[PDB]
Amino acid sequence: ANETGAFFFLINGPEIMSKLAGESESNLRKAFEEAEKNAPAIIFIDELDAIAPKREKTHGEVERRIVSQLLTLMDGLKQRAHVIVMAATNRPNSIDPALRRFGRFDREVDIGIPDATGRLEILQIHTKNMKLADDVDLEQVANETHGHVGADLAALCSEAALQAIRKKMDLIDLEDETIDAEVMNSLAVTMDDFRWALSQSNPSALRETVVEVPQVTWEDIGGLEDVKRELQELVQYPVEHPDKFLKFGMTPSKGVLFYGPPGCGKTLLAKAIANECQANFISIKGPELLTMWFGESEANVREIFDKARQAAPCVLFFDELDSIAKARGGNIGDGGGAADRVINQILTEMDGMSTKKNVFIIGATNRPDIIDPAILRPGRLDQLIYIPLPDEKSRVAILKANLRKSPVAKDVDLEFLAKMTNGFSGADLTEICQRACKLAIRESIESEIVPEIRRDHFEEAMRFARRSVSDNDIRKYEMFAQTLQQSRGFGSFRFPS
């Protein structure tokens, strides 16, 4: 509003209720009237969830009067002059549905927490006024923070400035009325201040939905070339060539569900597919899906699809989809079957969605024998992909992907190390590397009283090699995959004509 030559008028949320009843509505009415005279103008409401809590409050005679006054003032906004009404809130469910009718708030926009590439920018956009040192960078400090609101970072910068100036103002002791500018500019900030400020900071949005752009590509996942082509030919073709799908007359697929042994990077391929297609990514993990099975609140699963469809294109990810069945039993469990208050909510919402929208649903699970057949019905989740244990040639790439960040010596051989594992999944290799690089630090610290790993740290690290995927689950998964595949009898046949 300030850079369009239009008048800006701001009423936040409580300045209306602060005054006595009777004139609060008059102030709101005159706020709209004064803006019309200064056309073009704009109206912004900072807080509105405190204005119209018409869901569970049901108290106060003047509250509904103010809500109705606002509704009347905006229903009556004919052409006349040029004005735009802006409103801000915290959650979409904290707004009176009567305000969402056409002509009042028919257009909506959602703003999420920025990712690393966004928090990096918000760093300098606030710290530009202070010069930094030659060894202080904002790229690495923006990576540890993941749950900080955009205002959290600005507050962190301001607080770190105070710590930076405090360590010198005590020994300077410049007690005077006025202050010169020849010394206020030399108040540089160092590494010791951001660490303390970031450790002392208290994040605000830590449990909101994780809607960010991932930072992993196909190079981070080793092997698994069979599924890469299947995922590449399924979700990019309908977007890059929409006309070909419309010409034949059929609709593209809406979701892909895969199963396999736990610890095979079932989240990595779902995250990497978003980066190469230049789209957003959402994360609905198992614990995030068990939080409303007990909460008796089925309204929270309602807007997780709305926030995904608003940020089109996007992809929906579901982790350990059968994790709810473990708390309820399984194949038999209690007197019930394989459905509950949350299974019937997952598919009811995605049944009525438009396939034309640039959205995708990914279902990850470990045991496919517990999932109810209703989910796997043709039309919602028909694509089934089974990921087996990684081969010998794939584990080399898997290990070298994880060993990219840590320094690697020249005598480190990986081909022999990868071929000596048979019943080891993806997580078993990562934990071995973690143990080795942790044990390296112990020798470095003990020798202090070298920044390079050697071959001696390996033999002591493979001692703690764990084998989570036993032999009982391998056959159980193979018999299910073969039963669900069924390509026998007519695998090779030539048509006469």
Place this chain on the structure above:
Amino acid sequence: NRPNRLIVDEAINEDNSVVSLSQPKMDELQLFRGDTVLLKGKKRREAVCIVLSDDTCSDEKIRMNRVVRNNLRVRLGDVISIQPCPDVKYGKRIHVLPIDDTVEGITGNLFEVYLKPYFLEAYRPIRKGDIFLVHGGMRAVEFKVVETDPSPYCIVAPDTVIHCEGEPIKREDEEESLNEVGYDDIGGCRKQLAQIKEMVELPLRHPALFKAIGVKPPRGILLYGPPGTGKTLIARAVANETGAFFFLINGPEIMSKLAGESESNLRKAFEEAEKNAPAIIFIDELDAIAPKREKTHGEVERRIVSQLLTLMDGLKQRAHVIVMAATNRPNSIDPALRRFGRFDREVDIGIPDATGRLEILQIHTKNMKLADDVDLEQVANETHGHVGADLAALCSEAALQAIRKKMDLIDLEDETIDAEVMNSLAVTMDDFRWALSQSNPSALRETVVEVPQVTWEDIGGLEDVKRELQELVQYPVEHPDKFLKFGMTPSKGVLFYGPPGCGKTLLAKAIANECQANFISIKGPELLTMWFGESEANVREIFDKARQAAPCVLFFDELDSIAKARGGNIGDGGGAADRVINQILTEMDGMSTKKNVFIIGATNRPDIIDPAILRPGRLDQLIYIPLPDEKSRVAILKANLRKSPVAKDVDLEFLAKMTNGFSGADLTEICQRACKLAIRESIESEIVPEIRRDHFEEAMRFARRSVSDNDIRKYEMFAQTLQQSRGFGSFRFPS
């Protein structure tokens, strides 16, 4: 740049005006140890004090006492200058003249029994116009001389004489009443006050510095803790000693008046503070102001809440003001008040531990002198659930019992009371016992957040796990750069299992003391209280209180205790998850690993824990603690036998080797039974304070064996299955 300035910091000594400096300062200005030093302050006045050498406080600072604080008109966070004065001073006469501001209700001679025992064996220089506090007679009174010999040349010596008149003078507004609360009047909380010291001292002592820069200072600080923790006193002290106006509105003074002007009073409270800049605003009770969670009643309640929100949303730069608020629980505050620019900064105050309650004892009982056999160290150990105000109330009530046992037989019925007998009202051991037994604690069921008092010497043996715990949680903190260089993250939690009764809490408590961090305790019964309560919001802030008091460690006891009430491996139609398992790991999934926090999981049966908890990323470290060996039980028994006297003929090596299926608790119960049976013989022989060998054979009769042979194999097969180091235990790489 006149290299003589010194920063002002609060001292730690509880003596008279004695300053503390560092070791290079002694040779910087050629002073000796026992010399008289002169200090120069503002308002063109001098002072005299004594230098004390210290090497532990800091590298470059001074530690100046409360007397000369107000004597020299110097507040915390200011400049000061010091200089030697090797001049021989021999005082000859002094004028005594108290001020009637605090000398009320006290008659008789208060100059020959009150100031006399305090001046001897002190050798403290005095100056014309000094303000110092002294104790005696269940109260305290300051002193001020208006006309005496011209300073310097005043030293406390027996040859000096005294003379009194008996006409107090009227005080003026030039000085400040020292009877008010200072910074040293708060005890039991050192880490919490240091945060305020670096949060409030800058915007108040340096208004133009913040008015000239673009840094936005905090506009609101929220105070936590159970009622009576001392939230009001902290706010009163941080404002009275900064030269800033203090305005207090508690909680109900707004709702007491008729509707319509309550909002006007709140509005004018903010406006009057702006004129007296710099100023401060403190709200004693706010949970009663904005109960916008479940009340949903009252038309004017939301009006007052919105008025407060509007008044603090509109707080632009203009002048310098800090709004303080206090409450009882973080969940009793309107979330609309927690937005940025209103209460973005929060601080939590917990119940002090033994080392804190000890300090709060003398900080209140300093005004009464004690006996030679009455100590506050032992009496502060039995109390664990007492609020900081509980201890002050206990001291006041114990004073009443101490005076009652003599006032009946004295029977001094008169209008006025002399000070020659009110000072002789000493308190003995019989009064604290009765007062502590009759006292009613307030916070007994709050979260136990204190610093433990156990070290590695209290746990015998178990050297295998000591190195594993030492190389896991101290290395990332002491050497953060090494973990960042490799590019991987340190571990976030360690879960261990084993037979019950092996000190699964002792190693979790001892690891906090050697790392100088706080410790929290979430036991099994504390974890089963919300499985039935149907309230999942209480597990929400137990992590917030732990992360605010960084560094800290989270401890979980008998983690599978919930599964016992629901079954176990099979149980009901469900599996191994419920309304509380899914809340333990969901909150710790999204936490930042960079924070100095740790999670410890203790359990007895590891076959019942759901595999979701043990997933790589949340709790991946598994340690199995077996039964103690023969060489470890000797240390285990001697750790428990440290407090009780031990005879010279007591052999422990043979006593430890004769136990095979005995866990840690089985040895402690044997020692408890033996030392209890010792008291029976001592009492029976009364009609000796040393144990003998006869009390043992009668005590091992009641030896119990809780850990049977069925659980040992069950735990060993699980540990071996979860370890799996066979097949590739010894292999040499070719290259």
